[PDB]
Structure 1
Amino acid sequence: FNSSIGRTAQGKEFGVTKARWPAKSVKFVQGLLQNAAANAEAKGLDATKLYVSHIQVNQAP
Protein backbone atom coordinates (compact mmCIF):
# COMPACT_ATOMS: atom_id res chain seq x y z
CA PHE A 1 0.00 0.00 0.00
CA ASN A 2 2.64 2.42 -1.23
CA SER A 3 1.21 4.95 -3.56
CA SER A 4 1.45 8.74 -3.26
CA ILE A 5 3.52 8.91 -0.07
CA GLY A 6 6.84 10.67 0.28
CA ARG A 7 10.32 9.26 0.01
CA THR A 8 12.44 9.03 3.15
CA ALA A 9 16.05 8.16 3.95
CA GLN A 10 15.72 5.57 6.70
CA GLY A 11 13.90 3.12 4.44
CA LYS A 12 16.92 2.36 2.27
CA GLU A 13 18.41 0.13 4.96
CA PHE A 14 15.81 -2.43 3.89
CA GLY A 15 16.14 -1.79 0.18
CA VAL A 16 13.07 0.35 -0.47
CA THR A 17 12.79 4.00 -1.43
CA LYS A 18 9.77 5.06 0.63
CA ALA A 19 8.60 4.41 4.17
CA ARG A 20 6.60 5.86 7.08
CA TRP A 21 6.52 5.72 10.90
CA PRO A 22 3.05 4.38 11.84
CA ALA A 23 3.35 5.43 15.47
CA LYS A 24 -0.15 4.37 16.51
CA SER A 25 -0.37 0.96 14.83
CA VAL A 26 2.98 -0.02 16.33
CA LYS A 27 1.57 0.60 19.80
CA PHE A 28 -1.05 -2.16 19.57
CA VAL A 29 1.58 -4.59 18.31
CA GLN A 30 3.64 -4.28 21.51
CA GLY A 31 0.39 -4.99 23.37
CA LEU A 32 0.46 -8.46 21.88
CA LEU A 33 4.23 -8.92 21.64
CA GLN A 34 4.55 -9.07 25.36
CA ASN A 35 1.23 -10.93 25.68
CA ALA A 36 2.52 -13.67 23.38
CA ALA A 37 5.67 -13.49 25.48
CA ALA A 38 3.57 -13.53 28.66
CA ASN A 39 2.31 -17.06 28.07
CA ALA A 40 5.12 -18.55 25.98
CA GLU A 41 7.43 -17.85 28.90
CA ALA A 42 4.67 -18.98 31.27
CA LYS A 43 4.19 -22.31 29.51
CA GLY A 44 7.55 -23.92 30.24
CA LEU A 45 9.57 -22.64 27.31
CA ASP A 46 12.64 -20.48 27.42
CA ALA A 47 12.34 -16.79 26.60
CA THR A 48 15.50 -16.14 24.55
CA LYS A 49 14.77 -18.38 21.58
CA LEU A 50 11.31 -17.41 20.26
CA TYR A 51 10.55 -16.06 16.83
CA VAL A 52 7.38 -15.21 14.93
CA SER A 53 6.68 -17.92 12.39
CA HIS A 54 3.19 -16.61 11.60
CA ILE A 55 1.97 -13.03 11.88
CA GLN A 56 -1.43 -12.22 10.44
CA VAL A 57 -3.61 -9.17 9.76
CA ASN A 58 -7.07 -9.46 8.19
CA GLN A 59 -9.66 -6.73 8.05
CA ALA A 60 -12.61 -6.31 10.43
CA PRO A 61 -16.14 -5.04 9.68
Structure 2
Amino acid sequence: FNSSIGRTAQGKEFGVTKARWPAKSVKFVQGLLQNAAANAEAKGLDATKLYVSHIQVNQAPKQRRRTYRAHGRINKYESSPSHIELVVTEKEEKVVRLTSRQRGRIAAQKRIAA
Protein backbone atom coordinates (compact mmCIF):
# COMPACT_ATOMS: atom_id res chain seq x y z
CA PHE A 1 0.00 0.00 0.00
CA ASN A 2 2.58 2.46 -1.22
CA SER A 3 1.46 4.04 -4.50
CA SER A 4 2.38 7.75 -4.83
CA ILE A 5 3.88 7.97 -1.34
CA GLY A 6 7.24 9.71 -1.04
CA ARG A 7 10.83 8.47 -1.20
CA THR A 8 13.47 8.42 1.52
CA ALA A 9 17.01 7.23 2.17
CA GLN A 10 15.86 5.30 5.26
CA GLY A 11 14.44 2.56 3.03
CA LYS A 12 17.89 1.58 1.74
CA GLU A 13 18.40 -1.11 4.39
CA PHE A 14 15.25 -2.85 3.12
CA GLY A 15 16.05 -2.45 -0.58
CA VAL A 16 13.19 -0.02 -1.23
CA THR A 17 12.77 3.68 -1.87
CA LYS A 18 9.30 4.01 -0.30
CA ALA A 19 9.12 3.91 3.50
CA ARG A 20 7.25 5.86 6.15
CA TRP A 21 6.87 6.30 9.92
CA PRO A 22 3.27 5.30 10.83
CA ALA A 23 3.34 6.27 14.51
CA LYS A 24 -0.20 5.19 15.45
CA SER A 25 0.30 1.78 13.82
CA VAL A 26 3.63 1.43 15.60
CA LYS A 27 2.11 2.30 18.98
CA PHE A 28 -0.69 -0.24 18.56
CA VAL A 29 1.74 -2.94 17.44
CA GLN A 30 4.14 -2.34 20.33
CA GLY A 31 1.22 -2.40 22.76
CA LEU A 32 0.36 -5.86 21.47
CA LEU A 33 4.04 -6.86 21.54
CA GLN A 34 4.16 -5.87 25.21
CA ASN A 35 1.05 -7.95 25.84
CA ALA A 36 2.57 -11.00 24.12
CA ALA A 37 5.82 -10.60 26.07
CA ALA A 38 3.85 -10.46 29.33
CA ASN A 39 1.87 -13.55 28.28
CA ALA A 40 5.12 -15.38 27.54
CA GLU A 41 6.52 -14.42 30.95
CA ALA A 42 3.31 -15.64 32.60
CA LYS A 43 3.63 -18.94 30.71
CA GLY A 44 7.29 -19.26 31.73
CA LEU A 45 8.93 -18.93 28.30
CA ASP A 46 12.51 -17.74 27.94
CA ALA A 47 12.51 -14.08 26.92
CA THR A 48 15.78 -14.18 24.97
CA LYS A 49 14.56 -16.86 22.53
CA LEU A 50 11.26 -15.13 21.72
CA TYR A 51 10.67 -14.11 18.11
CA VAL A 52 7.63 -12.92 16.18
CA SER A 53 6.54 -16.23 14.67
CA HIS A 54 3.14 -15.00 13.48
CA ILE A 55 1.67 -11.56 12.86
CA GLN A 56 -1.46 -10.77 10.90
CA VAL A 57 -3.57 -7.67 10.28
CA ASN A 58 -7.17 -8.02 9.08
CA GLN A 59 -9.69 -5.35 8.08
CA ALA A 60 -12.10 -4.62 10.92
CA PRO A 61 -15.64 -3.42 10.08
CA LYS A 62 -15.54 0.11 8.70
CA GLN A 63 -16.88 3.07 10.68
CA ARG A 64 -18.95 5.53 8.68
CA ARG A 65 -19.10 9.30 8.61
CA ARG A 66 -20.26 11.63 5.86
CA THR A 67 -18.44 14.28 3.90
CA TYR A 68 -20.16 17.09 2.02
CA ARG A 69 -19.26 17.80 -1.59
CA ALA A 70 -20.00 20.54 -4.10
CA HIS A 71 -23.51 20.99 -5.50
CA GLY A 72 -25.14 19.56 -2.39
CA ARG A 73 -23.64 16.09 -2.65
CA ILE A 74 -22.77 13.60 0.09
CA ASN A 75 -20.00 10.99 0.07
CA LYS A 76 -18.75 8.39 2.52
CA TYR A 77 -15.96 9.29 4.94
CA GLU A 78 -14.94 5.99 6.46
CA SER A 79 -12.37 4.72 8.92
CA SER A 80 -10.43 1.56 8.04
CA PRO A 81 -9.96 -0.13 11.43
CA SER A 82 -7.80 -3.14 12.16
CA HIS A 83 -7.82 -6.52 13.81
CA ILE A 84 -4.25 -7.41 14.79
CA GLU A 85 -3.09 -10.78 16.06
CA LEU A 86 0.41 -11.96 16.80
CA VAL A 87 2.21 -14.98 18.24
CA VAL A 88 5.74 -15.00 19.70
CA THR A 89 7.52 -18.35 19.88
CA GLU A 90 10.79 -19.56 21.37
CA LYS A 91 13.66 -20.37 19.04
CA GLU A 92 14.49 -24.07 18.97
CA GLU A 93 16.70 -26.33 16.88
CA LYS A 94 12.42 -45.54 0.57
CA VAL A 95 11.95 -49.06 -0.78
CA VAL A 96 13.83 -49.58 -4.04
CA ARG A 97 12.11 -51.39 -6.92
CA LEU A 98 14.63 -52.83 -9.37
CA THR A 99 13.96 -55.01 -12.40
CA SER A 100 15.70 -58.27 -13.24
CA ARG A 101 18.20 -56.46 -15.47
CA GLN A 102 18.99 -53.91 -12.76
CA ARG A 103 19.53 -56.58 -10.10
CA GLY A 104 21.73 -58.65 -12.41
CA ARG A 105 23.78 -55.59 -13.35
CA ILE A 106 24.27 -54.67 -9.69
CA ALA A 107 25.33 -58.23 -8.85
CA ALA A 108 27.76 -58.18 -11.79
CA GLN A 109 29.26 -54.92 -10.55
CA LYS A 110 29.58 -56.40 -7.06
CA ARG A 111 31.44 -59.48 -8.27
CA ILE A 112 33.61 -57.51 -10.73
CA ALA A 113 34.64 -54.62 -8.44
CA ALA A 114 35.60 -56.34 -5.19
TM-score (normalizing by structure 2) = 0.51
1:14-41, CA deviations, whole angstroms, 9 ceiling, x for partnerless residues? 1001111001110011111010000101
How many pairs does the alignment contain? Answer: 60
User: Following the alignment from structure 1 to structure 2, what is the Cα–Cα distance between the partners of residues 36 and 22?
Assistant: 21
Aligned residue for 1:6, secondary structure, equals: coil
| Greater relative contact order (CA < 8 Å, ≥ 6 in sequence) | 2
The structure number with the bigger radius of gyration is 2
Task: Give the deviation of 1:47 after TM superposition.
Answer: 0.9
Task: Give the deviation of 1:52 after TM superposition.
Answer: 1.1
User: Tell me, which stretches of 5 or more residues in structure 2 are unaligned?
Assistant: 61-114
Of Structure 1 and Structure 2, the greater helix share is in 2
Task: Give the deviation of 1:12 after TM superposition.
Answer: 0.9
User: Tell me, which stretches of 5 or more residues in structure 1 are unaligned?
Assistant: none
User: Following the alignment from structure 2 to structure 1, what is the Cα–Cα distance between the partners of residues 27 and 46?
Assistant: 25
Task: Give the deviation of 1:9 after TM superposition.
Answer: 0.7
User: Following the alignment from structure 2 to structure 1, what is the Cα–Cα distance between the partners of residues 47 and 35?
Assistant: 13
Aligned residue for 2:24, secondary structure, equals: coil
Of Structure 1 and Structure 2, the greater strand share is in 2
Identity %: 100
- 1:27 lines up with 2:18 in the alignment: no
